[PDB]
Amino acid sequence: VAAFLKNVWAKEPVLVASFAIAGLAVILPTLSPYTKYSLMINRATPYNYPVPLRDDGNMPDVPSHPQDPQGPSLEWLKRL
Amino acid sequence: MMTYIVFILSIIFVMGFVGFSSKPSPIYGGLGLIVSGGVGCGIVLNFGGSFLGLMVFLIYLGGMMVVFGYTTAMATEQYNKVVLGTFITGLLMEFLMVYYVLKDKEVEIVFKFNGMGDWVIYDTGDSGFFSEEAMGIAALYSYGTWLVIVTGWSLLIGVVVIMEITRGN
Amino acid sequence: MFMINVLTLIIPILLAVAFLTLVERKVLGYMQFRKGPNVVGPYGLLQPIADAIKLFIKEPLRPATSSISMFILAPILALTLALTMWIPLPMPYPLINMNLGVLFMLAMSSLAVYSILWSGWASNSKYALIGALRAVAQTISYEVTLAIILLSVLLMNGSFTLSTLIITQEQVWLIFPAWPLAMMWFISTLAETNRAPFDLTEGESELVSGFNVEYAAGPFALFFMAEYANIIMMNIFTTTLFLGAFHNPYMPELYTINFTIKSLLLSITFLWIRASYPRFRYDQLMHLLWKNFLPLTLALCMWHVSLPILLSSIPPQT
Amino acid sequence: MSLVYMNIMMAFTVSLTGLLMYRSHLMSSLLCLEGMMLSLFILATLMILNSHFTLASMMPIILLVFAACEAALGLSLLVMVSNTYGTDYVQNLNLLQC
Amino acid sequence: MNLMITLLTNFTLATLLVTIAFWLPQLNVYSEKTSPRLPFSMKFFLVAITFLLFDLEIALLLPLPWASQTTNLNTMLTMALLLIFLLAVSLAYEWTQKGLEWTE
Amino acid sequence: MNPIILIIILMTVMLGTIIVMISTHWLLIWIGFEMNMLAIIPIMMKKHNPRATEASTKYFLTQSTASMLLMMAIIINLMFSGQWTVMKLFNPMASMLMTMALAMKLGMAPFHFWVPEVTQGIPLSSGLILLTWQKLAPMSVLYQILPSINLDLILTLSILSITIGGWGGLNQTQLRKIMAYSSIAHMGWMTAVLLYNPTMTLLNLIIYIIMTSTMFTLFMANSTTTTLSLSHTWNKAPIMTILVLITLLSMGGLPPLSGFMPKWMIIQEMTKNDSIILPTLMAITALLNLYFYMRLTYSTALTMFPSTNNMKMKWQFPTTKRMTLLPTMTVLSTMLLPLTPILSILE
Amino acid sequence: PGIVELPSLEDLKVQEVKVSSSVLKAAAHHYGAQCDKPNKEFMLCRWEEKDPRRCLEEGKLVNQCALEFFRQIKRHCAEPFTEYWTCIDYSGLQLFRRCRKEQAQFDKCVLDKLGWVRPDLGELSKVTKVKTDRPLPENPYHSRARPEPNPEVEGDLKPARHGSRLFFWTM
Amino acid sequence: SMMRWNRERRRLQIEDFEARIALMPLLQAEKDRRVLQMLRENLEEEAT
Numbered sequence A: 001v002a003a004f005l006k007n008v009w010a011k012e013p014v015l016v017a018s019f020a021i022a023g024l025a026v027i028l029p030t031l032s033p034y035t036k037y038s039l040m041i042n043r044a045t046p047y048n049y050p051v052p053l054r055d056d057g058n059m060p061d062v063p064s065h066p067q068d069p070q071g072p073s074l075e076w077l078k079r080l
Numbered sequence B: 001m002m003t004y005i006v007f008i009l010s011i012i013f014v015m016g017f018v019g020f021s022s023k024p025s026p027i028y029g030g031l032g033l034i035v036s037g038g039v040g041c042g043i044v045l046n047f048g049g050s051f052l053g054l055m056v057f058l059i060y061l062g063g064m065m066v067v068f069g070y071t072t073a074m075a076t077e078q079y080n081k082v083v084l085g086t087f088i089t090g091l092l093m094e095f096l097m098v099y100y101v102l103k104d105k106e107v108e109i110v111f112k113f114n115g116m117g118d119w120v121i122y123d124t125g126d127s128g129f130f131s132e133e134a135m136g137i138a139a140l141y142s143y144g145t146w147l148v149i150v151t152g153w154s155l156l157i158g159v160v161v162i163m164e165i166t167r168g169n
Numbered sequence C: 001m002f003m004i005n006v007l008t009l010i011i012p013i014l015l016a017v018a019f020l021t022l023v024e025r026k027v028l029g030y031m032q033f034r035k036g037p038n039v040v041g042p043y044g045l046l047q048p049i050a051d052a053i054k055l056f057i058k059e060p061l062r063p064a065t066s067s068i069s070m071f072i073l074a075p076i077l078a079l080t081l082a083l084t085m086w087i088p089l090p091m092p093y094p095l096i097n098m099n100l101g102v103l104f105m106l107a108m109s110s111l112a113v114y115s116i117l118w119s120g121w122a123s124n125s126k127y128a129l130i131g132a133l134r135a136v137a138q139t140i141s142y143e144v145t146l147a148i149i150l151l152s153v154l155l156m157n158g159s160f161t162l163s164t165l166i167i168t169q170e171q172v173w174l175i176f177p178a179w180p181l182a183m184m185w186f187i188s189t190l191a192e193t194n195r196a197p198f199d200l201t202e203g204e205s206e207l208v209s210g211f212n213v214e215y216a217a218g219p220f221a222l223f224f225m226a227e228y229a230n231i232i233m234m235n236i237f238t239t240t241l242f243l244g245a246f247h248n249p250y251m252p253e254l255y256t257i258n259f260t261i262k263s264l265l266l267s268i269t270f271l272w273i274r275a276s277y278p279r280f281r282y283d284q285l286m287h288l289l290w291k292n293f294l295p296l297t298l299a300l301c302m303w304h305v306s307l308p309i310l311l312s313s314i315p316p317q318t
Numbered sequence D: 001m002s003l004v005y006m007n008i009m010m011a012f013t014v015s016l017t018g019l020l021m022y023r024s025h026l027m028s029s030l031l032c033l034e035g036m037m038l039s040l041f042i043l044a045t046l047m048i049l050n051s052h053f054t055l056a057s058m059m060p061i062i063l064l065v066f067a068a069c070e071a072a073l074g075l076s077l078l079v080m081v082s083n084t085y086g087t088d089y090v091q092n093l094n095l096l097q098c
Numbered sequence E: 001m002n003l004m005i006t007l008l009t010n011f012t013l014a015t016l017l018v019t020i021a022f023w024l025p026q027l028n029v030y031s032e033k034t035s036p037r038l039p040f041s042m043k044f045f046l047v048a049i050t051f052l053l054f055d056l057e058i059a060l061l062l063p064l065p066w067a068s069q070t071t072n073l074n075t076m077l078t079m080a081l082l083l084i085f086l087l088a089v090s091l092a093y094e095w096t097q098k099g100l101e102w103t104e
Numbered sequence F: 001m002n003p004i005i006l007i008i009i010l011m012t013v014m015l016g017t018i019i020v021m022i023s024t025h026w027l028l029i030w031i032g033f034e035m036n037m038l039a040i041i042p043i044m045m046k047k048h049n050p051r052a053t054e055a056s057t058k059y060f061l062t063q064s065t066a067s068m069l070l071m072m073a074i075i076i077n078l079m080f081s082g083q084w085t086v087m088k089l090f091n092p093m094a095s096m097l098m099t100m101a102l103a104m105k106l107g108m109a110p111f112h113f114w115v116p117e118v119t120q121g122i123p124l125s126s127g128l129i130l131l132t133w134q135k136l137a138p139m140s141v142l143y144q145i146l147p148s149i150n151l152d153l154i155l156t157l158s159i160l161s162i163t164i165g166g167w168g169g170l171n172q173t174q175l176r177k178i179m180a181y182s183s184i185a186h187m188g189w190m191t192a193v194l195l196y197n198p199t200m201t202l203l204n205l206i207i208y209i210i211m212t213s214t215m216f217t218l219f220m221a222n223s224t225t226t227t228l229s230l231s232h233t234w235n236k237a238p239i240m241t242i243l244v245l246i247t248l249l250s251m252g253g254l255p256p257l258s259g260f261m262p263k264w265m266i267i268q269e270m271t272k273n274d275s276i277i278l279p280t281l282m283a284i285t286a287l288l289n290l291y292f293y294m295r296l297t298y299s300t301a302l303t304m305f306p307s308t309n310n311m312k313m314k315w316q317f318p319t320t321k322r323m324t325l326l327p328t329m330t331v332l333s334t335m336l337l338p339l340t341p342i343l344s345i346l347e
Numbered sequence G: 001p002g003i004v005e006l007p008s009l010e011d012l013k014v015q016e017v018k019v020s021s022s023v024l025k026a027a028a029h030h031y032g033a034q035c036d037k038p039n040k041e042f043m044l045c046r047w048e049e050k051d052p053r054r055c056l057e058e059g060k061l062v063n064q065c066a067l068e069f070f071r072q073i074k075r076h077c078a079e080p081f082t083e084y085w086t087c088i089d090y091s092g093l094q095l096f097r098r099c100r101k102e103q104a105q106f107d108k109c110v111l112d113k114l115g116w117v118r119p120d121l122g123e124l125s126k127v128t129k130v131k132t133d134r135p136l137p138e139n140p141y142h143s144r145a146r147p148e149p150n151p152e153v154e155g156d157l158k159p160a161r162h163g164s165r166l167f168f169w170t171m
Numbered sequence H: 001s002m003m004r005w006n007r008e009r010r011r012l013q014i015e016d017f018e019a020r021i022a023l024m025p026l027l028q029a030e031k032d033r034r035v036l037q038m039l040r041e042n043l044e045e046e047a048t
């Protein structure tokens, strides 16, 4: 496999760079630790309006004000 | 007049279709379909289909009608009554329809049609920081998975099919 | 007030196209160890004027045309597309600020092959039509890599907006993350405008450019100035696309000076490529597209899709 | 209904009756077929933009792609017919009467 | 609107240049001069059809800079790499079955 | 053709048919018809002679026109219903255009004018695919849109198809044109019972596909494309004359054979809905189909036409053709009438 | 059909916030920090009633609390705010990132003279809960009574009485 | 460099979108009174 690789790198290096770049593009996002943060940043970008909830009496995780402690936070995004 | 801009572009669209569909030659028919594709693109652009109108220019006129003119140039020779007669026939039918639906604000050929400018039927709200048309097209990759699979398979098969039937063996 | 802005776009385009002929003949002169024009004006500065006045009073050549209408419409379409490619160019402000300026320029450049095709139809020679079909196949071949390189670069931009591409390159030139895209872009735009070493119509490897052939052709100055408008425009577009300059929003002239100097250097790089290499054979630049550029362009397209996802560097839409 | 839909449907029927009445050239037939596709594209696009039906914004693109691949198939058929008979005339395609 | 004004101005300047370049050299009265199918190639048509089909594949690829903004990123990345891979597979079948030959 | 490419292209034909059969969205129906035509075009051009290029061009023009009328019917449906579910159509104009488009795809009269030309222009295997497999997807769409199908339109198409497919085959000596006019008459029989009971439509389609597959497989195994070439079969393989005899007697609708089953069930379900004149005229018109079937049996099995001398060399060689499922299809096309209440599995 | 019921022009009279969009965008983070409760009462009423005619009093309370917000800016920090929205107002895209020192001066003066804290990155997009006194809309779509469904199938599945009953087939 | 700067551009986009969100109740109130104003005007002129 080492003779074939050097032979195709001597004869057709454009195709070797092509298959190498394509293979890295395939197998690399499953190995990267920052692929999680792409999903996290896209789901944290507020396109719509945060339509509020009627306070029934039992919603301890939902804040009453945006500056309240409870709720989803983006400190991981400010820091990274 | 200016509130009727999509209507006037649609009249130019029908006039161009009567132009090439009366079939003078595939060269001039190609030219008429190019001018028709441009004005129908303008019709799409005046509703807010900016990406879809640029898809008309880039894909329809940009690739496909270029391939039609290319293949015409390989199959016709460079150097009537029926074409001009059918042209003025379609032009008179179209202008009589225009005259009816303008003087009456109503016509019925197959369906009932309003005669006012088509500005009336629009929405009165915004879409925020996106285009709804752009986001719906962008969802081809997250929602249109099966659609992408069958479209890519049909295009790969189409490449295979064209290489089969033009091979001659 | 807006028509003033349209005219101060489009008339300096024609003046820059006029003096690009002087810059070409001079820079190709000094690279060929000679001088360019220096007799007609002081340092040759009256050569474009004299040459344009000469071309506008010269007789329509000998022959007649197969189709009068396309013989008229091909220079009209060529000049109209060559002038409309400039209106979304952010320098630092585009004339027509549109959300889809990139896709507009890609579509209007895809429309430019109809001038070549209709001038091939309008000539009477069946050999000039073959040369036009070779040129059309060349240009539509390199439009593929134009589209895919442009898409791969815009994956770091976030949108099709050309003015956003100044904001994208505020920390670094975009040639640093995408130099293989940049060099295949530059050579593909070179092959777009029928520019040497890809000029097969104006050179040999051509069945009809062969001395005492037929083929009534259009007035040469119009297609020529459309072509040089396209050359300056594609170099300004490469400058915006890969070498985007510093923009102070209170001093737009700094960006205008900077992109102008870079666009002049890149157009002189076109001049310096055409005076350095022999021509491709036709199947050799078909080889260069279909077997060399397009595999790397698809591989780097996969790379630039998957790379902002794996690096958490997806650009914003707005 | 709206006034522009009349013109786009009438454009479809004009390119239909052009496609249903051949003169000589198969290329003009294919031009009428793709004019039918163009009118269908515009009509679907005006409906989908008018309705603000977001997901069907990808529908006219799929229409355009499939029917342009169909057009490529038809041009290859015309090319094989032209390499058989020298022209693209539909009166040369009459071997199957017997 | 300003786009339509600009398109009309570019079309008008182009038509004015074409009309001048045809009618201005007709001012000088010249000596009236009195003396005195194309071959098909399959490869020319095939490079145009290969262009058309890869251009449709590009038309599928053009909404990618908007498609990266989605919340379904794993599906999006899969289908993006799948469209570019099918374009590459179309190119490989065009390669290996002698389709890119003598216009390589 | 490369056998790999042949298998992939036949899988793409089948894939387009399956996409029409399973999908709930009109765009995917249209996509399935596009994929089906795009993949079946090389099967018609398998031998690369001008009759196959002419047949593929005529097939392309008809199926392309029908696909565009189908998309216009879909677009009028999106106007007048705002949605895309493959179910009834919410406008009689969309219903008329879609019934016309499917009538063009099936080659029912008066859109029948491509079927004998295209079937004559192509080989027997591709003609088999065209006359059996390509009938599946438009009958599935007609099966799904039947709450909106106009009755007078579909019965006009049906009786006109039966009559023109009866009179068309009486003048023919080419086997592929006989099978094509047989196709037109049987598609009339299928669509006549559609709005009354579509289970009997599926029964007619299944029995028709079995019998037509039997006849095309016998014509492939004997390598006979004309009547007079089929006439030499008694001196070459006499069992084949027996099989084409019983299969042509089946397709004519004679009891006790299984080709009587569909038309008897169609008459059975049309008299329930107080239609007497129409199944009687359909049954009397099918006697023309039986007439040219009996013409072929006279030329093949019941008499011995003169052969030539070179048949003696072909006596010394067996058939090395893969006569795939030919005994199974011959048994199912003839001896299935005692199993007539098996039709409930299609309910 | 029926007559649409509209409020009078007296019921649409309110003291508007007649400022420009750069004045609002410059003040938007402190406006979202301070004018939270009438705004979220209004947006809850607006997504629940699905009718702008049932939301006019909450719209007037929004339009009143916004005026109290800008009056409270105008009494203490009119000049840093004016410099800051002028700098926001120069930009054609109205960038926050071109204006960080004027934002710093405005936030400094606002935190000192009014005690207001600018929201962090992530807070004004939180989903909050609203305590209301108005009732929940029981039929906001004004849907009429749904049709009664077809009966379900029930019972054990017996064999067919004398089989298929197809003309003579005794099974 | 593009990693650091596109992450900064995403944080700036979130700041812009939060400014929009904080302004949406006021704009929705003005839009509701706007459309009810115009419909009441059309209703009165339809009555006359």
Ligand SMILES: CCCCCCCCCCCCCCCCCC(=O)OC[C@H](COP(=O)([O-])OC[C@H](O)COP(=O)([O-])OC[C@H](COC(=O)CCCCCCCCCCCCCCCCC)OC(=O)CCCCCCCCCCCCCCCCC)OC(=O)CCCCCCCCCCCCCCCCC
Binding pocket: F256, F337, F338, F339, G168, G169, G170, G171
């Ligand atoms: C402890 C555990 C084990 C206990 C075991 C207990 C049993 C021990 C014996 C085991 C063997 C049992 C065999 C079957 C039972 C008998 C069935 C029967 O006769 O039904 C009478 C059936 C009705 O008469 P039935 O008096 O109401 O019922 C008496 C029993 O209670 C009939 O009972 P059913 O009421 O339940 O009958 C049900 C129903 C009763 O039927 C009905 O409801 C009426 C509908 C019948 C079909 C009508 C079709 C009309 C159009 C087609 C015309 C075909 C023409 C004849 C054939 C032409 C040449 C192929 O039958 C059917 O639906 C089946 C369809 C007919 C097939 C009959 C069985 C054949 C098996 C052997 C086949 C060999 C080839 C024979 C020829 C092929 C055609 C039959 O009559 C006919 O179907 C007429 C034809 C005669 C049937 C075949 C006779 C069976 C033995 C044949 C041996 C000789 C073969 C010669 C060489 C090959 C031919 C060249």
Ligand SMILES: CCCCCCCCCCCCCCCCCC(=O)OC[C@H](COP(=O)([O-])OCC[N+](C)(C)C)OC(=O)CCCCCCCCCCCCCCCCC
Binding pocket: A011, A012, A013, A014, A016, A017, A020, A021, C175, C180, C182, C183, C184, C186, C187, C197, C238, C242, C273, C277, C288, C291, C292, C293, C296
């Ligand atoms: C924007 C400003 C300008 C940008 C730069 C451009 C300025 C310089 C211009 C110079 C003059 C060029 C004139 C035209 C020349 C045309 C001919 C030519 O060059 O043909 C191209 C040649 C063609 O090949 P060839 O013809 O020379 O070689 C023979 C080819 N075969 C074997 C097929 C017969 O090369 C290419 O196609 C290269 C294209 C760009 C390569 C990008 C490389 C990326 C590398 C990534 C890493 C690789 C390592 C391995 C993987 C590692 C993974 C971690």
Ligand SMILES: CCCCCCCCCCCCCCCCCC(=O)OC[C@H](COP(=O)(O)OCCN)OC(=O)CCCCCCCCCCCCCCCCC
Binding pocket: A008, A012, A015, A016, A017, A018, A019, A020, A022, A023, A026, C295, C296, C298, C299, E085, E088, E089, E091, E092, E095, E096
């Ligand atoms: C897995 C990730 C996804 C992979 C798919 C995506 C690919 C993206 C790139 C697109 C390429 C499109 C075109 C591909 C055509 C391949 C066939 C080919 O070119 O074969 C011919 C070639 C010899 O060239 P020839 O025909 O002679 O050319 C004329 C000049 N001599 O033959 C050769 O040169 C040999 C070609 C095969 C061997 C190449 C090996 C490259 C290895 C690189 C490192 C590993 C990368 C990971 C992928 C696995 C590779 C085995």
Ligand SMILES: CCCCCCCCCCCCCCCCCC(=O)OC[C@H](COP(=O)(O)OCCN)OC(=O)CCCCCCCCCCCCCCCCC
Binding pocket: C015, C041, C042, C045, C046, C049
């Ligand atoms: C955005 C910037 C664009 C810039 C575009 C222009 C670039 C070049 C600038 C000009 C450079 C210098 C030009 C000098 C030309 C020659 C002048 C001259 O004196 O020519 C001599 C000639 C005959 O003179 P004669 O009387 O015979 O003298 C005998 C003396 N005993 O006398 C004559 O022929 C008569 C006088 C002719 C003068 C011509 C001058 C140049 C005109 C060019 C046209 C454009 C002008 C600028 C427009 C844009 C800016 C406002």
Ligand SMILES: CCCCCCCCCCCCCCCCCC(=O)OC[C@H](COP(=O)(O)OCCN)OC(=O)CCCCCCCCCCCCCCCCC
Binding pocket: B034, B035, B036, B037, B038, B039, B041, B042, B043, B045, B046, B050, B051, B053, B054, C073, C076, C077, C080, C081, C084, C097, C098, C099, C100, C101, C104, E001, E003, E004, E007, E011
């Ligand atoms: C042989 C014949 C003669 C040949 C020479 C002349 C014709 C060829 C050259 C002209 C080509 C014209 C192309 C014009 C449309 C380009 C697409 C477009 O409009 O993009 C700009 C922009 C999209 O950006 P976006 O920001 O999303 O939209 C604005 C909303 N904020 O969208 C907008 O700004 C929308 C503006 C309103 C809609 C403009 C419609 C223009 C008029 C109709 C088409 C005219 C051309 C017809 C003929 C074409 C060629 C045959």
Ligand SMILES: CCCCCCCCCCCCCCCCCC(=O)OC[C@H](COP(=O)(O)OCCN)OC(=O)CCCCCCCCCCCCCCCCC
Binding pocket: F010, F125, F126, F128, F129, F132, F133, F136, F202, F206, F209, F210, F213, F217, F220, F322, F323, F324, F325, F329
């Ligand atoms: C509601 C309905 C849902 C769907 C239900 C199922 C519908 C089934 C429809 C069947 C349609 C079959 C069409 C024909 C097969 C397609 C593939 C093909 O062409 O195979 C033939 C093959 C090709 O070989 P080739 O070499 O190219 O041919 C020239 C001769 N040397 O080889 C040959 O030419 C060799 C000769 C023999 C070929 C015999 C093939 C018979 C296949 C059909 C069997 C019967 C159908 C299944 C049972 C009934 C189902 C309803």
